[PDB]
Amino acid sequence: MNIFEMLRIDEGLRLKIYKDTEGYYTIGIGHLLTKSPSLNAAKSELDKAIGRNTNGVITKDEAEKLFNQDVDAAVRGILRNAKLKPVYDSLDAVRRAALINMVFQMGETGVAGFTNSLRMLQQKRWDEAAVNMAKSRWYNQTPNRAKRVITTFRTGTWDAYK
Ligand SMILES: [Cl-]
Ligand SMILES: [Cl-]
């Protein structure tokens, strides 16, 4: 297992524009197009992302390409974030993947607001961080996924993904 497989499990793969769990227009493997309510806006952002007139539909290949870019950006975002980088640097390889997952889902910003958890992770207080992370909107809204990511931080293994 790795970050790509892990996220492919959490996000799925859809080749037509769809609404995510928050009702926002997405496509592919969790690639958010726009927070706007307008499908047109969504189609527009999509064509601009792919570089062609898609008409709201993309191929597997195109989805994977967006995916690679998005994972790369998430990593790079962490590494540029003063609150995140240090946490990330302190972790083992499995747990780093958990941290990338969260950033991919919620943005650097949303993640950086888990201040207290982050510190606990940094201190390697696994059980504690897990409990603190569960008291979040994130957990309450997407509980099954959050559970998987949390277990990953708690154990440092991929068991939740097996
Ligand atoms: Cl893009
Ligand atoms: Cl979920």
PDB file of C-alpha atoms and ligand atoms in Angstrom:
ATOM      1  CA  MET A   1       0.000   0.000   0.000  1.00  0.00           C
ATOM      2  CA  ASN A   2       0.930   3.626  -0.638  1.00  0.00           C
ATOM      3  CA  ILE A   3      -0.559   7.112  -0.679  1.00  0.00           C
ATOM      4  CA  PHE A   4      -2.008   6.733  -4.137  1.00  0.00           C
ATOM      5  CA  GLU A   5      -3.735   3.484  -3.436  1.00  0.00           C
ATOM      6  CA  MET A   6      -4.889   4.758  -0.117  1.00  0.00           C
ATOM      7  CA  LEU A   7      -6.484   7.801  -1.532  1.00  0.00           C
ATOM      8  CA  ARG A   8      -7.900   5.890  -4.463  1.00  0.00           C
ATOM      9  CA  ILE A   9      -9.687   3.843  -1.883  1.00  0.00           C
ATOM     10  CA  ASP A  10     -10.968   6.776   0.063  1.00  0.00           C
ATOM     11  CA  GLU A  11     -12.060   8.933  -2.816  1.00  0.00           C
ATOM     12  CA  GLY A  12     -13.176   6.490  -5.518  1.00  0.00           C
ATOM     13  CA  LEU A  13     -12.950   7.177  -9.282  1.00  0.00           C
ATOM     14  CA  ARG A  14     -15.693   8.868 -11.294  1.00  0.00           C
ATOM     15  CA  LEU A  15     -15.332   9.902 -14.865  1.00  0.00           C
ATOM     16  CA  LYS A  16     -18.343  12.269 -14.961  1.00  0.00           C
ATOM     17  CA  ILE A  17     -18.776  15.464 -12.856  1.00  0.00           C
ATOM     18  CA  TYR A  18     -20.345  14.548  -9.556  1.00  0.00           C
ATOM     19  CA  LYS A  19     -21.184  16.234  -6.274  1.00  0.00           C
ATOM     20  CA  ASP A  20     -18.978  15.381  -3.349  1.00  0.00           C
ATOM     21  CA  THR A  21     -20.148  14.736   0.219  1.00  0.00           C
ATOM     22  CA  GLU A  22     -20.449  18.560   0.716  1.00  0.00           C
ATOM     23  CA  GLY A  23     -22.405  18.951  -2.568  1.00  0.00           C
ATOM     24  CA  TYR A  24     -19.534  20.407  -4.521  1.00  0.00           C
ATOM     25  CA  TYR A  25     -18.695  19.646  -8.083  1.00  0.00           C
ATOM     26  CA  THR A  26     -15.849  17.194  -8.362  1.00  0.00           C
ATOM     27  CA  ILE A  27     -14.524  14.741 -10.891  1.00  0.00           C
ATOM     28  CA  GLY A  28     -12.022  11.877 -11.164  1.00  0.00           C
ATOM     29  CA  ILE A  29     -10.347  10.871  -7.927  1.00  0.00           C
ATOM     30  CA  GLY A  30     -11.545  13.492  -5.551  1.00  0.00           C
ATOM     31  CA  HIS A  31     -10.535  16.456  -7.693  1.00  0.00           C
ATOM     32  CA  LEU A  32     -12.632  19.411  -6.580  1.00  0.00           C
ATOM     33  CA  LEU A  33     -13.603  21.625  -9.389  1.00  0.00           C
ATOM     34  CA  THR A  34     -15.468  24.434  -7.728  1.00  0.00           C
ATOM     35  CA  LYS A  35     -17.412  25.396  -4.651  1.00  0.00           C
ATOM     36  CA  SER A  36     -19.905  27.141  -6.907  1.00  0.00           C
ATOM     37  CA  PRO A  37     -23.457  25.900  -7.397  1.00  0.00           C
ATOM     38  CA  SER A  38     -23.241  26.319 -11.125  1.00  0.00           C
ATOM     39  CA  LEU A  39     -22.615  23.350 -13.304  1.00  0.00           C
ATOM     40  CA  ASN A  40     -21.426  25.610 -15.951  1.00  0.00           C
ATOM     41  CA  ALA A  41     -18.834  27.020 -13.799  1.00  0.00           C
ATOM     42  CA  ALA A  42     -17.838  23.395 -13.107  1.00  0.00           C
ATOM     43  CA  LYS A  43     -17.658  22.466 -16.759  1.00  0.00           C
ATOM     44  CA  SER A  44     -15.599  25.551 -17.348  1.00  0.00           C
ATOM     45  CA  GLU A  45     -13.096  24.752 -14.594  1.00  0.00           C
ATOM     46  CA  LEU A  46     -12.947  21.250 -15.900  1.00  0.00           C
ATOM     47  CA  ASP A  47     -12.018  22.167 -19.472  1.00  0.00           C
ATOM     48  CA  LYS A  48      -9.498  24.598 -18.202  1.00  0.00           C
ATOM     49  CA  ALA A  49      -7.951  21.813 -16.058  1.00  0.00           C
ATOM     50  CA  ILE A  50      -7.815  19.263 -18.860  1.00  0.00           C
ATOM     51  CA  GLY A  51      -7.011  21.595 -21.669  1.00  0.00           C
ATOM     52  CA  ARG A  52      -9.908  20.543 -23.962  1.00  0.00           C
ATOM     53  CA  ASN A  53     -13.633  20.639 -24.403  1.00  0.00           C
ATOM     54  CA  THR A  54     -14.653  17.822 -22.176  1.00  0.00           C
ATOM     55  CA  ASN A  55     -18.278  18.331 -21.908  1.00  0.00           C
ATOM     56  CA  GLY A  56     -18.139  17.072 -18.244  1.00  0.00           C
ATOM     57  CA  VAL A  57     -16.607  13.734 -19.020  1.00  0.00           C
ATOM     58  CA  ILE A  58     -12.893  12.695 -18.857  1.00  0.00           C
ATOM     59  CA  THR A  59     -10.959   9.531 -19.473  1.00  0.00           C
ATOM     60  CA  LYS A  60      -9.207   7.340 -16.880  1.00  0.00           C
ATOM     61  CA  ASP A  61      -5.943   8.653 -17.972  1.00  0.00           C
ATOM     62  CA  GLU A  62      -6.994  12.249 -17.522  1.00  0.00           C
ATOM     63  CA  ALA A  63      -8.325  11.450 -14.018  1.00  0.00           C
ATOM     64  CA  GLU A  64      -5.004   9.888 -13.105  1.00  0.00           C
ATOM     65  CA  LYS A  65      -3.179  12.841 -14.331  1.00  0.00           C
ATOM     66  CA  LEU A  66      -5.226  15.199 -12.208  1.00  0.00           C
ATOM     67  CA  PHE A  67      -4.633  12.771  -9.354  1.00  0.00           C
ATOM     68  CA  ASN A  68      -0.845  12.816  -9.674  1.00  0.00           C
ATOM     69  CA  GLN A  69      -0.868  16.570  -9.751  1.00  0.00           C
ATOM     70  CA  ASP A  70      -3.075  16.815  -6.730  1.00  0.00           C
ATOM     71  CA  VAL A  71      -0.969  14.460  -4.625  1.00  0.00           C
ATOM     72  CA  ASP A  72       2.158  16.267  -5.607  1.00  0.00           C
ATOM     73  CA  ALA A  73       0.628  19.560  -4.678  1.00  0.00           C
ATOM     74  CA  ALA A  74      -0.526  18.248  -1.302  1.00  0.00           C
ATOM     75  CA  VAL A  75       3.012  17.051  -0.454  1.00  0.00           C
ATOM     76  CA  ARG A  76       4.477  20.335  -1.549  1.00  0.00           C
ATOM     77  CA  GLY A  77       1.891  22.231   0.379  1.00  0.00           C
ATOM     78  CA  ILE A  78       2.808  20.405   3.586  1.00  0.00           C
ATOM     79  CA  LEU A  79       6.468  21.085   3.028  1.00  0.00           C
ATOM     80  CA  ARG A  80       5.917  24.735   2.586  1.00  0.00           C
ATOM     81  CA  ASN A  81       3.639  25.014   5.631  1.00  0.00           C
ATOM     82  CA  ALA A  82       5.361  26.166   8.758  1.00  0.00           C
ATOM     83  CA  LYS A  83       2.852  24.427  10.979  1.00  0.00           C
ATOM     84  CA  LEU A  84       2.788  21.236   9.001  1.00  0.00           C
ATOM     85  CA  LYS A  85       6.279  20.585   7.902  1.00  0.00           C
ATOM     86  CA  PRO A  86       7.680  19.875  11.267  1.00  0.00           C
ATOM     87  CA  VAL A  87       4.979  17.406  12.011  1.00  0.00           C
ATOM     88  CA  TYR A  88       5.468  15.697   8.783  1.00  0.00           C
ATOM     89  CA  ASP A  89       9.237  15.582   9.286  1.00  0.00           C
ATOM     90  CA  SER A  90       8.790  13.922  12.622  1.00  0.00           C
ATOM     91  CA  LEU A  91       6.642  11.066  11.351  1.00  0.00           C
ATOM     92  CA  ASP A  92       7.342   7.608  10.004  1.00  0.00           C
ATOM     93  CA  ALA A  93       6.366   6.791   6.335  1.00  0.00           C
ATOM     94  CA  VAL A  94       2.978   5.322   7.110  1.00  0.00           C
ATOM     95  CA  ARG A  95       1.830   8.167   9.249  1.00  0.00           C
ATOM     96  CA  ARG A  96       3.085  10.712   6.688  1.00  0.00           C
ATOM     97  CA  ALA A  97       0.688   9.160   4.226  1.00  0.00           C
ATOM     98  CA  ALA A  98      -2.161   9.686   6.742  1.00  0.00           C
ATOM     99  CA  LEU A  99      -1.203  13.316   6.969  1.00  0.00           C
ATOM    100  CA  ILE A 100      -1.165  13.715   3.201  1.00  0.00           C
ATOM    101  CA  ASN A 101      -4.624  12.159   3.018  1.00  0.00           C
ATOM    102  CA  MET A 102      -6.026  14.689   5.355  1.00  0.00           C
ATOM    103  CA  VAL A 103      -4.444  17.578   3.470  1.00  0.00           C
ATOM    104  CA  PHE A 104      -5.758  16.289   0.181  1.00  0.00           C
ATOM    105  CA  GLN A 105      -9.262  16.131   1.691  1.00  0.00           C
ATOM    106  CA  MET A 106      -9.422  19.292   3.640  1.00  0.00           C
ATOM    107  CA  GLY A 107      -6.633  21.591   2.585  1.00  0.00           C
ATOM    108  CA  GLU A 108      -3.601  22.745   4.431  1.00  0.00           C
ATOM    109  CA  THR A 109      -5.684  25.150   6.089  1.00  0.00           C
ATOM    110  CA  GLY A 110      -8.274  22.854   7.502  1.00  0.00           C
ATOM    111  CA  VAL A 111      -5.518  20.560   8.669  1.00  0.00           C
ATOM    112  CA  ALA A 112      -3.379  23.218  10.266  1.00  0.00           C
ATOM    113  CA  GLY A 113      -6.446  23.913  12.561  1.00  0.00           C
ATOM    114  CA  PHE A 114      -5.985  20.535  14.204  1.00  0.00           C
ATOM    115  CA  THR A 115      -3.394  22.252  16.334  1.00  0.00           C
ATOM    116  CA  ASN A 116      -3.768  20.218  19.425  1.00  0.00           C
ATOM    117  CA  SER A 117      -3.753  16.869  17.558  1.00  0.00           C
ATOM    118  CA  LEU A 118      -0.766  17.935  15.540  1.00  0.00           C
ATOM    119  CA  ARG A 119       1.250  18.604  18.654  1.00  0.00           C
ATOM    120  CA  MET A 120       0.301  15.250  20.062  1.00  0.00           C
ATOM    121  CA  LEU A 121       1.357  13.587  16.867  1.00  0.00           C
ATOM    122  CA  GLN A 122       4.600  15.349  17.125  1.00  0.00           C
ATOM    123  CA  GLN A 123       5.047  14.056  20.605  1.00  0.00           C
ATOM    124  CA  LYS A 124       4.162  10.514  19.428  1.00  0.00           C
ATOM    125  CA  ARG A 125       1.150  10.313  21.758  1.00  0.00           C
ATOM    126  CA  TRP A 126      -0.861   8.170  19.323  1.00  0.00           C
ATOM    127  CA  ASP A 127      -3.884   7.172  21.320  1.00  0.00           C
ATOM    128  CA  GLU A 128      -4.336  10.660  22.582  1.00  0.00           C
ATOM    129  CA  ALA A 129      -4.111  12.302  19.237  1.00  0.00           C
ATOM    130  CA  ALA A 130      -6.652   9.790  17.888  1.00  0.00           C
ATOM    131  CA  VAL A 131      -9.092  10.700  20.507  1.00  0.00           C
ATOM    132  CA  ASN A 132      -8.608  14.392  20.011  1.00  0.00           C
ATOM    133  CA  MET A 133      -8.954  14.073  16.230  1.00  0.00           C
ATOM    134  CA  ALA A 134     -12.359  12.380  16.601  1.00  0.00           C
ATOM    135  CA  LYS A 135     -13.840  15.482  18.139  1.00  0.00           C
ATOM    136  CA  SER A 136     -14.081  17.283  14.846  1.00  0.00           C
ATOM    137  CA  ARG A 137     -16.644  18.087  12.253  1.00  0.00           C
ATOM    138  CA  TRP A 138     -14.443  16.049   9.909  1.00  0.00           C
ATOM    139  CA  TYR A 139     -15.035  12.938  11.927  1.00  0.00           C
ATOM    140  CA  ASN A 140     -18.763  13.541  12.413  1.00  0.00           C
ATOM    141  CA  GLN A 141     -19.346  14.239   8.693  1.00  0.00           C
ATOM    142  CA  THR A 142     -17.220  11.442   7.184  1.00  0.00           C
ATOM    143  CA  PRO A 143     -16.858   9.055   9.955  1.00  0.00           C
ATOM    144  CA  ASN A 144     -15.829   5.870   8.082  1.00  0.00           C
ATOM    145  CA  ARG A 145     -13.069   7.593   6.270  1.00  0.00           C
ATOM    146  CA  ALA A 146     -11.961   9.596   9.268  1.00  0.00           C
ATOM    147  CA  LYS A 147     -11.820   6.305  11.211  1.00  0.00           C
ATOM    148  CA  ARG A 148      -9.491   4.813   8.626  1.00  0.00           C
ATOM    149  CA  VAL A 149      -7.105   7.790   8.741  1.00  0.00           C
ATOM    150  CA  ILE A 150      -7.207   7.946  12.498  1.00  0.00           C
ATOM    151  CA  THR A 151      -6.436   4.226  12.873  1.00  0.00           C
ATOM    152  CA  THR A 152      -3.532   4.760  10.552  1.00  0.00           C
ATOM    153  CA  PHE A 153      -2.153   7.494  12.827  1.00  0.00           C
ATOM    154  CA  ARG A 154      -2.864   5.400  15.877  1.00  0.00           C
ATOM    155  CA  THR A 155      -1.102   2.237  14.664  1.00  0.00           C
ATOM    156  CA  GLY A 156       1.341   3.320  12.077  1.00  0.00           C
ATOM    157  CA  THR A 157       0.147   0.346   9.935  1.00  0.00           C
ATOM    158  CA  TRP A 158      -2.130   0.015   6.884  1.00  0.00           C
ATOM    159  CA  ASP A 159      -4.497  -2.344   8.600  1.00  0.00           C
ATOM    160  CA  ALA A 160      -7.509  -0.128   8.185  1.00  0.00           C
ATOM    161  CA  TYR A 161      -6.977  -0.352   4.510  1.00  0.00           C
ATOM    162  CA  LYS A 162      -6.767  -4.153   4.322  1.00  0.00           C
TER     163      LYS A 162
HETATM  164 CL    CL B   1      -5.803  21.863 -11.983  1.00  0.00          CL
HETATM  165 CL    CL B   2     -16.662   8.514   5.169  1.00  0.00          CL
END
